[PDB]
């Protein structure tokens, strides 16, 4: 592992960040002082959920809660393939992270994000309560249930 960390090959270190992510070694990746890994995540954060989650962990441990709430909220409003329940977790985290002070950011900007995440989380829970009840309902034909699961187990719908 010395030979690994003693390298200056950049495509290599990118390939190793991806490999650590694959194997699940949050142990070793979260323990890198470097910003090089943060910058690498900032480009692909809004591309994949698993990468965004890593980026948000780096922000939170650095008391940058508002920036994580921003990543999580945009991810919940996006058209990436994300389940409704995963979008409930993202909003719930963003709601908490925007409710606490982050230095350098105005109280107004925090509250406006904490409010957008609170409303979207309220709608998401309604949608989750619906989807669950509809799937379990004995009086609903199977043919329709599959159709319900397609349109409700994804991005959050209007009221």
């Amino acid at each position: 592992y010395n030979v690994v960390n003693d390298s200056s090959d950049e495509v290599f270190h990118f390939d190793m960040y991806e490999w650590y992510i694959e194997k699940g070694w949050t142990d070793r990746i979260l323990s890198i002082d470097s910003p090089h890994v943060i910058t690498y995540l900032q480009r692909l954060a809004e591309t994949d959920f698993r990468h965004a989650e890593l980026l948000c962990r780096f922000y939170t441990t650095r008391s940058r809660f508002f920036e994580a709430a921003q990543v999580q909220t945009n991810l919940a409003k996006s058209d990436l393939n994300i389940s409704l329940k995963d979008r409930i977790i993202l909003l719930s985290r963003a709601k908490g992270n925007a409710s606490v002070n982050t230095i350098g950011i105005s109280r107004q900007q925090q509250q406006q994000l904490n409010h957008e995440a609170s409303e979207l989380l309220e709608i998401a829970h309604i949608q989750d309560d619906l989807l669950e009840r509809l799937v379990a309902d004995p009086r609903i034909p199977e043919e329709r249930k599959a159709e319900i699961e397609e349109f409700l187990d994804g991005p959050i719908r209007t009221l």
């Binding site: 003693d6 090959d9 950049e10 910003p35 890994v37 809660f65 606490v100 230095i103």
Partner: protein
């Protein structure tokens, strides 16, 4: 700014807490916004990720581009060398260590301090723990402030339960408790400080001397903050017996006397108060086991003091037989056992250690020359501090004085017969062998009482409000016929119990007749010594004279009735006696005390007093 880093976030947060503490509520809306952004910080007090090999080998393999979170940075042969150096000195992860160094380049503090880049990382790392821990003390301190709005006082209270102690609020709700994390947290500070001296001493045996001194200061401050946080948490009845046993074992395994022991003293005091005294876990059965458990020690004075405090605090149960159950238990045997244990603790030097700690706590760089040699004529056998620059705080001193006054009240209201028998034993010992110096237990105890009651008139008034209480009873009983040391200790106590004018007037009215000490005997002894010197003198007589002069000066500076009476009293004529004593062959201390007494008497005077003073001066100088 708005996008502040971890360091700037804690530094700004600290300023806000000081505002609310200094009666400035202009940042209420801004304060709540910070606690939510640093929620993950308050959860873990102090935790450094272990040095991993995955980052060590990867950092040096491709030191070209670094990705931390969302931003990206470029590593060069110069910066990469600082990461490995910082990680080795502090044993910190390469990823976390790199982030610290990156924060310095952005803020650009290398020019503000003109130091190597790798050294700044050590300071920046210590600053985080300082504010991260120091800010917690302000939260609990403000949550207990009674001079603020009740609503705001409760906001910081519930917040600390969840942010610091990890306890959710009442309106909601695998995890580890706070104490076990705090104990392990303080442990890391000790191991880190120990390894620091070993490595530092090796290379020393440079431009980093001041940095090492600042790091040691930050470490001791963080340890004091952790101790205060632990004390506050224990004050909320959030402990158990396992933590108490662990703390007792850690104390038994104590090696050297330093500031850490003085910081932990109040922790054990609060532990005994919550468990030993009937003001907490009032399980009488549980207290019996702890008594035998407390009653191996690498320092006997510590065990003696602990046993004395435990006995003093636990003797409050056996006062009456109506508030608790005391059936099928003998009293005389337990009383004799506690008495012999307290006597053994005294012989081992419990009060001596307490007095040495109290003295070392208020160690001041400079002292007023009007009180030189006061309370410094005993036989101190306890080793002193190494004199390193580790100044104490104010809240710690306040808590120490409060605990000492509480212990004094308990010992006075629970063990009067013990003090009586000790005084009689000392008297008979001094009588059967005057050539030898008996023990100074009572004098040391009175000096500790004086140190406890200093600059606190709210507590000193208790000795004058109720003249029929136990406090006034002991005050009047300690004024009977005794030796020079006891009289000097009582005079010093009276002098220190005159922080204001009301207490000074009360002491004046209580000293004069309305047997206990009276001004008549004082002036008689003064005239006797004057005639003896003018027709040798022992240290005890000089000490008594100096104590009398200091007491008179204090009463004249604090009280007005005494200043107006003694100045023109025909039966005393203190001025003539002090002048006849000063014109004699005596050391300079007595002359200085007489001059200070004259100054105090002449602090507020009129034309007639000025004329009389000038007449006396001319008559005695011509």
């Amino acid at each position: 700014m708005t996008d502040l880093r971890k360091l700037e976030a804690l530094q700004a947060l600290h300023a806000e807490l000081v505002a609310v503490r200094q009666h400035r509520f202009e940042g209420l809306q801004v304060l709540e916004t910070l606690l939510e952004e640093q929620t993950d910080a308050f959860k873990a007090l102090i935790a450094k990720p272990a040095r991993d090999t995955k980052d060590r080998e990867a950092l040096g393999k491709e030191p070209k581009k670094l990705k931390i979170g969302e931003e990206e940075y470029s590593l060069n042969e110069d910066f990469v060398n600082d990461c490995l150096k910082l990680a080795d000195e502090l044993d910190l992860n390469e990823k976390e260590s790199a982030r610290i160094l990156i924060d310095c380049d952005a803020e650009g503090d290398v020019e503000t301090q003109s130091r190597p880049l790798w050294e700044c990382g050590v300071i920046r790392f210590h600053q985080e723990r300082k504010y991260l821990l120091d800010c917690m003390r302000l939260i609990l301190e403000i949550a207990a402030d009674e001079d603020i709005d009740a609503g705001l006082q409760e906001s910081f209270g519930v917040a600390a339960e969840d942010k610091i102690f990890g306890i959710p609020p009442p309106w909601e709700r695998q995890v580890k408790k706070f104490i076990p994390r705090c104990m392990e947290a303080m442990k890391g500070v000790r191991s880190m400080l120990q390894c620091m001296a070993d490595k530092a001493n090796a290379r020393n045996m440079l431009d980093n001397q001041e940095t090492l001194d600042f790091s040691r200061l930050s470490l001791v401050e963080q340890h004091e903050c952790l101790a205060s946080i632990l004390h506050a948490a224990v004050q909320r009845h959030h402990a158990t017996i396992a933590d108490f046993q662990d703390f007792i074992k850690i104390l038994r395994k104590w090696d050297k006397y330093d500031h850490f022991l003085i910081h932990l003293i109040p922790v054990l005091a609060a532990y005994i108060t919550e468990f030993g005294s009937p003001e907490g876990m009032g399980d009488l059965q549980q207290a019996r086991r702890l008594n035998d458990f407390i009653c191996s020690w690498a320092l006997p004075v510590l065990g003696a003091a602990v046993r004395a405090w435990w006995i003093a605090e636990h003797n409050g149960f056996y006062l009456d037989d109506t508030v608790q159950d005391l059936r099928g238990i003998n009293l005389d045997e337990e009383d004799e056992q506690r008495t012999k244990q307290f006597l053994d603790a005294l012989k081992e030097g419990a009060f001596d250690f307490i007095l040495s700690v109290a003295a070392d706590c208020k160690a001041q760089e400079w002292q007023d020359p009007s009180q030189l040699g006061a309370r410094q004529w005993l036989q101190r056998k306890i080793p002193s501090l190494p004199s390193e620059p580790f100044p104490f705080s104010h809240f710690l001193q306040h808590s120490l004085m409060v605990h000492l006054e509480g212990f004094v009240d308990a010992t006075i209201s629970n063990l009067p017969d013990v003090l009586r028998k000790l005084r009689t034993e000392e008297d008979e010992q001094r009588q059967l062998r005057p050539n030898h110096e008996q023990d100074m237990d009572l004098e040391r105890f009175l000096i500790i009482i004086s140190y406890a009651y200093e600059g606190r008139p709210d507590a000193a008034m208790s000795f004058w409000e109720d003249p029929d209480s136990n406090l006034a009873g002991f005050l009047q009983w300690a004024s009977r016929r005794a030796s020079t040391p006891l009289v000097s200790a009582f005079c010093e106590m009276l002098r220190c119990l005159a922080d204001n004018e009301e207490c000074a007037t009360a002491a004046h009215n209580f000293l004069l007749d309305e047997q206990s000490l009276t001004w008549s005997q004082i002036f008689k002894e003064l005239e006797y010594f004057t005639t003896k010197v003018c027709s040798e003198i022992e240290p005890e007589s000089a000490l008594m004279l100096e104590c009398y002069l200091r007491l008179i000066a204090k009463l004249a500076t604090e009280s007005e009735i005494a200043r107006k009476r003694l100045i023109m009293d025909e039966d005393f004529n203190l001025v003539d006696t002090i002048l006849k004593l000063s014109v004699g062959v005596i050391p300079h201390r007595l002359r200085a005390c007489i001059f200070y007494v004259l100054k105090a008497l002449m602090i507020r005077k009129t034309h007639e007093e000025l004329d009389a003073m000038w007449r006396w001066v001319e008559a005695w100088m011509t």
